[PDB]
Design a protein around this nucleic acid. Structure first.
Ligand code: MG
Ligand code: ZN
Ligand code: ZN
Ligand code: ZN
Lengths: 115, 44, 48, 59, 29, 432, 59, 48, 78, 181, 466, 258, 66
RNA sequence: GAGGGAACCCACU
């Protein structure tokens, strides 16, 4: 009756932005990235890959409500760095990680199949 | 229209004000046939 | 209360009508307060 | 001025509900009664009446 | 012979099964 | 037709109820004035009324199938009256018992007991994840309680960040020793059982029901009386969110392994029960051989029953104390009891050691047959197992006589509830 | 349905696991709940409390 | 009769003046939500 | 000559906010400048903070007399 | 004040219910103003005495200057004024609490503002509040009767209590030895 | 006697032969007060203070003290007795397959579970209650854990992926009956498809889903404002007025069956069964066999549920705090015995008074299968993949889906029907009624001091008048 | 750049599961890879059922549910297939869906098992997995009962419905020796050893590693049959990379716009 | 009433395994040995076959109306 | 874009 459609957990409707950025005015060099229609998957990997960056002073994510489909990632960096640049570098590093992991998995399957 | 008899599985022809009774066996309970309208089920 | 060696000051009852007939209306007000407090705080519960 | 609820619509939600309804016993004393004695589990109910199965509330 | 203690559960549930084979559950009605 | 859709100043538009609408929310029976409180509406995509967990205590609500009522104030007059009079934060402290009505309950309480223990250390990622659920956070990560070998924060640091303003409070944990306030370690507690909050910082102590619950002088009470209803509302929400998201890391369960006792404890409980049953037999022999001296104000039945019940209650108390002393710090029954979230030590005793004597109308199981409680006993059997003393625990399982006597005991509670409802309601109506 | 095998009941569109024990009145299954009463023809002596009779036999 | 219309908790005074059925009310099952504040209720979209 | 409390009670505050919000919703003039707020409750609330609500509270003493207090005369303590 | 207290509380129970928590307020003043308890304080004791006097003057429950209104004011705040003079003792503010002058002024302002917040609002439906506050605990409720039936025997003024009783106290030696009792 | 009763179907030996042999006899309550019962034949064989040497009768098995709905409780002697009472209440509310010929029957209300399972942990009394043949419930992998806080205060978290796979999916069948009736030749009701320019007083709905006999056909989607039976009665240009049978509001479905016959007095009579598939939902009521009732608080997908090292995610997560005050230890023993039963490949015995089954024996059996002996498992966080620091009690427990869905209970009113007499809102959600703002609510709003809200509830949201 | 350098060691590769090990990666990457296994690997499953005749004892929504749970071989065809939401056709077309038909009439006195072998697809690449063990039973018919239906199967992943979940069980494990103490055993001797444990029989736990972090992750990905398990893992890596690429694109637009 | 296609907990196919399970039980396998032969190793999949009641075999004993 | 009551039973918190 009030059951939402199952595609609403991952499909952006019309006029919905995917990612929005808000400056966090509490502390300097902090940003709130609000990502719509994503969940703990991307939030968790981006959070940990941001945690690997030594210029990132704070990195975290939350799902504000599990019945909504929204991720809030707060990133605070050093004053000589940017939270947007930190986010971009984290996604680039994760993409390179997954490309390297994909090619090594293909090599390993080929080696396993040939014997 | 076409009514399935409850007992003998036959297709009876029934009009308005016609008594509800199978011609073949006189069984008193009829059932309507499945609609020809095409209903769609999501497989969920 | 009239009895020999019985304290005429602190000897009390749990009957509300009887204290009202013997001691008055302010006395039965205080006795009713005491009885209600005992009933409420038997469980350890507190009411203001 | 007669007893009500002697005959009831048979419960058919579950097979267990049907079986429990068909083996149901009723004390015809008023459910507004605040005396505990007819409602208590008597010792004599051993093996004759289920000690667990009873409704909640007025009955 | 006497039913030994190790066969007692099987024996008692056999006689209970026999009771419910004959009487059933709504026998009083 | 679109000329009917024209809006002039002074018209009214009956718009659908949106986010932030003020409502009165109600659970029957409406006993006190915190059974109808003001809530802000948030639209959520399922078919139930979603309610905060701290709010279930003033409503006397749980989620075993409760339905609740939602009244929408239809005018700005009553919207403002509900907003300024009957909102949930304004109803935190009751005028009945000058204490809060809502506290921390049933995972947040257990996990704030576990979270504010001394040996809880959080890594940098865990601290960041927990500070993400702190709405009143000022954006500054505190200096960790340990900087080397690894930067680690304690749970008391994060809860000090939760605690609002500069609250000052002294409480005692439920496991506080009696002799500790006189000892040499009064202000440095070895068991971390004295809660001290100073300048809004949890300096020391393990939080529990006695600190975060609905009692007077507690931390939520002091937070209300010092900071006001809005700051206290944020305090409640921040406690629940931060502790519930740390509980995903820590985790909390109950299993059959928490109801197992030691073999030595099983032998101790069996010895206590055997000795107490022998003592009851000795008192029975004394009364049977006419050697039982009646006490002032009592008949011979009353003295015999009082002495037998004293022996059996001492047995139940000693077996229970042995059961609780057997418990480890990893036990989850103990974890929920010392936090005050659920259960008592009596429940632990009944589950682990001895269910105890089953009473009907304040006395032992009555002779419902001719001088027998059940037809499985001899006539005039006044021993413990005949008259309803359950010497088994809930894990051991009850014998059929013990099962029937325990059913007799529980039927008493069911009857008492079902017949106390109407009389109590009539008393409330007459008082009103 | 008396004496009918399970095949015979299934040919009648009846459940063989159906216990019976009920009536069909106007298409509605009605079950007669058993009613408790004091046993007849037996002398019972009680004590009427707050009465002008101390003991009372009854049959 | 008229007295039966007026007396009782289902009568006119207690059942229709002291309390009554109201418009703009909803009722449904409650479920928990730890992500809501204490002053906040989650409402279905159909009720709203 | 006024013997009632100099503090606005919570019932007085609730009804003053409701009445002022209803007046603003029926296009009463706004006593203060507003920074783009549309809800009449927030406007009435900040007129109450600014001590500018043009309402006199008439408090009825039990003898039948009354006292007239301006909203600006009472203390907004809560 | 001590003698008046011992008349009011003859059992010696010192737990009372009073509006302002003075010990926690003094702790708050100590923490806010960074009061060092190990140093001499710059608070004159006569400032403590005069401040408590003027504060007790400005805590008003029964208004008016006529002697009947003045007596009702002295009665209405008697326990709170005794507790205020006990807690803000010049000796205790000197050697125990160590508060400074500005901390003491903040303390006086805090006590006055928190006291005026505690006064009952005209319009409080206190009868219905009392009825709910005595009926809601009834839901969680020598052979003396207690609980719900005793409350029923109390509010319904019953000429026949279920277990009527007397608590007889004895005078002198008859109270002490068992045989005269 | 036992060797003869092992072959009822061969020797024609039965229970009546056991009675005729003088082996068993029927003892009533007034005779039972003079007999001397041994609970077991272990009592007959005795030594030391034998307690009694004059036993006259013996119990056949003590688990026969329980009734029908209490005989499905596993380990009822490990539970607190009010919880056995509550389960005896809620076993009559559980969805299963209530009877085999449910397709023939057109009952007013019917609930049929898709995939009822027999319990892994049964009592032997279940073999005579036919719970193996008409089961009501599913063996669910239940974890007893605090996970995200959505299972607090008697709530459960369900696996949404399991629910997608048919876990506790059911069908609600609702039947509507109608008949033609001539109240004299003046009225003469008839099943015919109404026409807009012919019939008086329609309800602004559509009639195109009806067939030409005035009846809808099986297989047609229906909703709240949809007519299923078109019945018209002649008025003695609008010669006839509408008295059509509507579908009940807010419950969509599909017409499962339409049946036409003659009633007792020979008028045409129609029963329409409408089928509505109930998928488990937030707020649906689920219960164990131990009085552990609770509504679904949230549903998580399989990648969000906590998982073991084998990738097993619980179907249901219940709160730990539902156990201690309730003292439903039989729930924990049923879960442990069901883990042993699913691993061994056997249906576990949970007959109440059985010394052959003990918690230590089940624990040793579980330790024999590569698990922890107390039923705990190392679970990993579904969201982050980190190990949960505590080890979670998890295993198969039989759950039941109770009849109390939220969608049969959710009600809201803005304005609508009023009563004829007092012009106040109607009764119940079935007639779009209002909720009662009764006397105690009036008392609470008096104590609140909200005089205008009390006025608006009691005057102008119920029955304004001039 | 601070990316990891994760390595893969396949320890087992059968037709129904793959057991592998990922070293030198973070725990969040490992858990996200597991989550994409369960949720975000697209396969082809039936999502549109239209029943012409159903005389069976099982009603129409129940048959449709049982059909949707049937797995279809999705290897190399799900990659080139389109989501119905992204297709230019109006309702359905071969570029976005696969058409199945079923027509079973029972005319004999024996019970007819309508299985997945009776699902006749118009595309040869997308057939039921058991049509390449017994067949998945859909319904059983007695004499005179009938089931005619037409289905369309479309691309989708398990975040929408569990019928599009390609994995049976994703066993995931890390730190099998409990060297990190991410779980705390009250009595460590009671706990059976992991399959990947490197301890002798006497020991019960590795010594505590204060400097340790989760670095080696053991997977057993079991396939339900729609894809080969190695294809499940490769498509999961591709899908997670595609999600990150899409998010980086939208982040680039949002950065440039402000 | 009929064997589910998937295991509820994990999603392994258990719909093609009911007839083989009954054939193994007819071949005097124990239930555990029969479940081991089918490759059902997780107890979540084992309970799907172990606890299954096959009501469709008794539903098919009624004469079909349509 | 809304046309019954009453009694009784069952159940929910
Ligand atoms: Mg409840
Ligand atoms: Zn025929
Ligand atoms: Zn297409
Ligand atoms: Zn499985």
């Amino acid at each position: 009756m009030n059951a939402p459609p199952a595609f609403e957990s991952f499909l952006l409707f019309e006029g919905e932005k995917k990612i929005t950025i808000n400056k966090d005015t509490k502390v300097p060099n902090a940003c709130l990235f609000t990502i719509n229609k994503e969940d703990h998957t991307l939030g968790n990997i981006i959070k940990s890959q941001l945690l690997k960056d030594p210029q990132v002073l704070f990195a975290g994510y939350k799902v504000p409500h599990p019945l909504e489909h929204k991720i809030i990632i707060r990133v605070q960096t050093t004053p000589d760095y940017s939270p947007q640049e930190a986010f971009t570098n984290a996604i680039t590093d994760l993409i390179s990680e997954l490309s390297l992991l994909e090619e090594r998995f293909r090599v390993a399957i080929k080696d396993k199949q040939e014997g | 229209m076409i009514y399935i008899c409850g007992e003998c599985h036959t297709e009876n022809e029934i009009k308005s004000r016609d008594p509800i009774r199978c011609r073949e066996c006189g069984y008193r309970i009829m059932y309507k046939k499945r609609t020809k309208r095409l209903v769609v089920f999501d497989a969920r | 209360l009239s009895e020999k060696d019985v304290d005429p000051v602190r000897t009390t009852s749990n009957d509300i009508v009887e204290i009202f007939t013997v001691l008055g209306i302010e006395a039965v007000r205080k006795a009713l307060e005491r009885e209600l407090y005992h009933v409420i705080s038997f469980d350890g519960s507190y009411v203001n | 001025q007669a007893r009500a609820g002697v005959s009831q619509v048979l419960n058919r939600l579950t097979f267990a509900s049907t079986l429990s309804h068909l083996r149901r016993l009723n004390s015809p004393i008023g459910r507004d009664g605040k005396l505990a004695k007819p409602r208590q589990l008597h010792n004599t109910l051993w093996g004759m009446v289920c000690p667990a199965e009873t409704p909640e509330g007025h009955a | 012979d006497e039913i030994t203690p190790d066969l007692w559960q099987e024996a008692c549930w056999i006689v209970i099964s026999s009771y419910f084979d004959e009487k059933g559950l709504v026998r009083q009605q | 037709k679109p000329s009917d859709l024209h809006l002039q100043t002074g018209y009214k538009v009956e718009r659908h109820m949106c986010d932030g609408d003020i409502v009165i929310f109600n659970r029957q029976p409406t006993l006190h004035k915190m059974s109808m409180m003001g809530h802000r509406v948030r639209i959520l995509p399922w078919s139930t009324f979603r309610l905060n967990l701290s709010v279930t205590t003033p409503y006397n609500a749980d989620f075993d199938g409760d339905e609740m009522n939602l009244h929408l104030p239809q005018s700005l007059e009553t919207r403002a009256e509900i907003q300024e009079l009957a909102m949930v934060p304004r109803m935190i402290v009751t005028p009945q018992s000058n204490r809060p009505v809502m506290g921390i309950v049933q995972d947040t309480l257990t996990a704030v007991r576990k979270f504010t223990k001394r040996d809880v250390f959080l890594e940098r990622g865990e601290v960041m994840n927990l500070l993400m659920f702190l709405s009143t956070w000022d954006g500054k990560v505190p200096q960790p309680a340990i900087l080397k070998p690894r930067p680690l924060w304690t749970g008391k640091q994060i809860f000090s960040l939760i605690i609002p303003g500069h609250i000052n409070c002294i409480r005692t944990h439920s496991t506080h020793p009696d002799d500790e306030d006189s000892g040499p370690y009064k202000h440095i507690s070895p068991g971390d059982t004295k809660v001290v909050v100073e300048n809004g910082e949890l300096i020391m102590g393990i939080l529990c029901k006695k600190s975060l619950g609905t009692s007077a002088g507690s931390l939520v009470h002091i937070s209300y009386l010092e900071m006001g209803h809005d700051i206290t509302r944020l305090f409640y929400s921040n406690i629940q969110t931060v502790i519930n998201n740390w509980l995903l890391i820590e985790g909390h369960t109950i299993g059959i392994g928490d109801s197992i006792a030691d073999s030595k404890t099983y032998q101790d409980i069996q010895n206590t029960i055997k000795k107490a049953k022998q003592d009851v037999i000795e008192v029975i022999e004394k009364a049977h051989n006419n050697e039982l001296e009646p006490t002032p104000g009592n008949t011979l039945r009353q003295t015999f029953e009082n002495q037998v019940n004293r022996i059996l209650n001492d047995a139940r108390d000693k077996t229970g104390s042995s059961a609780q002393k057997s418990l480890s710090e990893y036990n989850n029954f103990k974890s929920m009891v010392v936090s005050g979230a659920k259960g008592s030590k009596i429940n632990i005793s009944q589950v682990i050691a001895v269910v105890g004597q089953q009473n009907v109308e304040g006395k032992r199981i009555p002779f419902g047959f001719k001088h027998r409680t059940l037809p499985h006993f001899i006539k005039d059997d006044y021993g413990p197992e005949s008259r309803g003393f359950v010497e088994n625990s809930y894990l051991a399982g009850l014998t059929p006589t013990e099962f029937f006597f325990h059913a007799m005991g529980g039927r008493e509670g069911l009857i008492d509830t079902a017949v106390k409802t109407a009389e109590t309601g009539y008393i409330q109506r007459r008082l009103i | 349905l008396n004496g009918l095998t399970d095949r015979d009941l299934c040919e009648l569109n009846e459940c063989p696991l159906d216990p019976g024990g009920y009536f069909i009145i106007n298409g509605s299954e009605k079950v007669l709940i058993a009613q408790e009463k004091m046993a007849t023809n037996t002398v019972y002596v009680f004590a009427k409390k707050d009465s002008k009779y101390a003991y009372t036999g009854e049959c | 009769s008229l007295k039966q219309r007026l007396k009782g908790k289902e009568g006119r005074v207690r059942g229709n003046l002291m309390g009554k059925r109201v418009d703009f009310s909803a009722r449904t099952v409650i479920t928990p939500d730890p992500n809501l504040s204490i002053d906040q209720v989650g409402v279905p979209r159909s009720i709203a | 000559k006024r013997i009632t409390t100099p503090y606005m009670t919570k019932y007085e505050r609730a009804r003053v906010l409701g009445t002022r919000a209803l007046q603003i919703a029926m296009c009463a003039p706004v006593m203060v400048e507003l920074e783009g707020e549309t809800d009449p409750l927030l406007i009435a609330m900040k007129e109450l903070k600014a001590r500018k609500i043009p309402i006199i509270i008439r408090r009825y003493l039990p003898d039948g007399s009354y006292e007239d207090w301006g909203v600006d005369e009472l203390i907004i303590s809560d | 004040d001590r003698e008046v207290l011992r008349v009011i509380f003859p059992t010696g129970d010192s737990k009372v219910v009073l509006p302002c928590n003075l010990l926690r307020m003094i702790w708050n003043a100590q923490k806010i103003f960074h009061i060092n308890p190990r140093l001499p304080s710059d608070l004159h004791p006569i400032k403590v005495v005069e401040g408590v006097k003027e504060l007790s003057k400005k805590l008003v429950i029964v208004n008016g200057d006529d002697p009947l209104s003045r007596q009702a004011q002295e009665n209405a705040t008697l326990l709170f004024n005794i507790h205020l003079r006990s807690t803000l003792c010049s000796r205790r503010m000197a050697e125990e609490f160590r508060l400074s002058g500005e901390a003491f002024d903040w303390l006086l302002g805090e006590i006055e503002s928190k006291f005026n917040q505690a006064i009952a609002h005209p319009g409080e439906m206190v009868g219905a509040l009392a009825a709910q506050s005595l009926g809601e605990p009834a839901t969680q409720m020598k052979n003396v009767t207690l609980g719900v039936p005793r409350l029923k025997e109390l509010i319904n003024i019953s000429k026949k209590p279920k277990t009527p009783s007397l608590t007889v106290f004895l005078l002198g030696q008859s109270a002490r030895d068992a045989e005269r009792a | 006697h036992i060797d003869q009763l092992k072959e009822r179907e061969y020797n024609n030996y039965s229970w009546q032969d056991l009675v005729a042999s003088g082996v068993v006899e029927y003892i009533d309550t007034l005779e039972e007060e003079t007999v001397m019962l041994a609970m077991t034949p272990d009592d007959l064989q005795e030594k030391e203070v034998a307690y009694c040497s004059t036993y006259t009768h013996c119990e056949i098995h003590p688990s026969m003290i329980l009734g029908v709905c209490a005989s499905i409780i596993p380990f009822p002697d490990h539970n607190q007795s009010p919880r056995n009472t509550y389960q005896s209440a809620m076993g009559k509310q559980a969805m299963g397959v209530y009877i085999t010929n449910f397709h023939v029957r057109m009952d007013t209300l019917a609930h049929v579970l898709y995939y009822p399972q027999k319990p892994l942990v049964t009592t032997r009394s279940m073999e005579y209650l036919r719970f193996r043949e008409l089961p009501a419930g599913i063996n669910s992998i239940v974890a007893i854990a605090s996970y995200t806080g959505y299972n607090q205060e008697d709530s459960v978290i369900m696996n949404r992926s399991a629910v997608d796979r048919g876990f506790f999916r059911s069908v609600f069948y609702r039947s509507y009956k109608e008949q033609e009736s001539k109240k004299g030749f003046d009225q003469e009701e008839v099943f015919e498809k109404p026409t807009r320019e012919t019939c008086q007083g329609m309800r602004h709905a559509i009639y195109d889903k009806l067939d030409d006999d005035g009846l809808i056909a099986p297989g047609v989607r229906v909703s709240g404002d949809d007519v299923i039976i078109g019945k018209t009665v002649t008025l003695p240009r609008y010669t006839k007025r509408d008295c059509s049978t509507f579908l009940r509001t807010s419950e969509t479905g599909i017409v499962d069956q339409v049946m036409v016959t003659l009633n007792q007095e020979g008028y045409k009579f129609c029963k329409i069964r409408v089928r509505s598939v109930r998928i488990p939902q937030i707020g649906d009521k689920f219960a164990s066999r131990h009085g552990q009732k609770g509504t679904c608080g949230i549903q998580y997908r399989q990648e969000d549920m906590p998982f073991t090292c084998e990738g097993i995610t619980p179907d249901i997560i219940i709160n730990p705090h539902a156990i201690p005050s309730r003292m439903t230890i039989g729930h924990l023993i049923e879960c442990l015995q069901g883990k042993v039963s699913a691993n061994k490949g056997e249906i576990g015995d949970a007959t109440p008074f059985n010394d052959a089954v003990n918690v230590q024996k089940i624990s040793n059996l579980l330790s024999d299968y590569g698990y922890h002996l107390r039923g705990n498992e190392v679970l990993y966080n579904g969201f982050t993949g980190r190990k949960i620091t505590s080890q979670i009690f998890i295993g198969p427990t039989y759950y039941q889906r109770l009849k109390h869905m939220v969608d049969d209970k959710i009600h809201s009113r803005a304005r609508g029907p009023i009563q004829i007499l007092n012009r106040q809102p109607m009764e119940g959600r079935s007639r779009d009624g209002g909720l009662r703002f009764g006397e105690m609510e009036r008392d609470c709003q008096i104590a609140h001091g909200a005089a205008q809200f009390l006025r608006e509830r009691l005057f102008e949201a119920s029955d304004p008048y001039q | 750049p601070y990316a990891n350098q994760p390595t893969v060691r396949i320890t087992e590769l059968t037709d129904e599961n793959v057991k592998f090990i990922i070293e030198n990666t973070d725990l969040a990457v490992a858990n996200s890879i597991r989550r994409v296994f369960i949720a975000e690997v697209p396969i082809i499953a039936i999502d549109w059922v239209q029943i012409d005749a159903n005389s069976s004892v099982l009603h129409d929504e129940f048959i449709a549910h049982r059909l949707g749970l049937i797995p279809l071989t999705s290897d190399d065809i799900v990659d080139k297939l389109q989501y119905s939401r992204d297709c230019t056709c109006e309702e359905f077309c071969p570029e976005c869906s696969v058409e199945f038909t079923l027509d079973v009439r029972c005319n004999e006195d024996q019970t007819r098992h309508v299985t997945s072998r009776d699902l006749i697809s118009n595309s040869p690449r997308v057939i039921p997995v058991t049509s390449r063990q017994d067949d998945i039973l859909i319904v059983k018919l007695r004499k005179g009962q009938e089931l005619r239906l037409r289905a369309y199967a479309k691309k989708g992943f398990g975040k929408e419905h569990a019928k599009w979940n390609p994995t049976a069980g994703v066993a995931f494990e890390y730190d099998p020796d409990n060297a990190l103490r991410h779980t705390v055993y009250p009595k460590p001797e009671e706990w059976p050893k992991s399959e990947y444990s490197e301890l002798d029989e006497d020991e019960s736990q590795a010594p505590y590693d204060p400097n340790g972090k989760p670095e080696r992750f053991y997977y057993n990905v079991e396939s339900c049959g729609s894809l080969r398990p190695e294809t499940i893992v490769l498509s999961a890596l591709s899908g997670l990379k595609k999600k990150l690429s899409d998010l980086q694109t939208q982040l680039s637009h949002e950065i440039q716009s402000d | 009433m009929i064997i589910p296609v998937r295991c509820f907990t994990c999603g392994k196919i258990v719909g093609n395994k009911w007839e083989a399970y009954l054939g193994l039980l007819q071949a005097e396998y124990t239930e555990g040995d029969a479940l081991d032969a089918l490759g059902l190793k997780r107890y979540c999949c084992r309970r799907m076959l172990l606890a299954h009641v096959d009501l469709i075999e008794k539903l098919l004993n009624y004469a079909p109306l349509e």
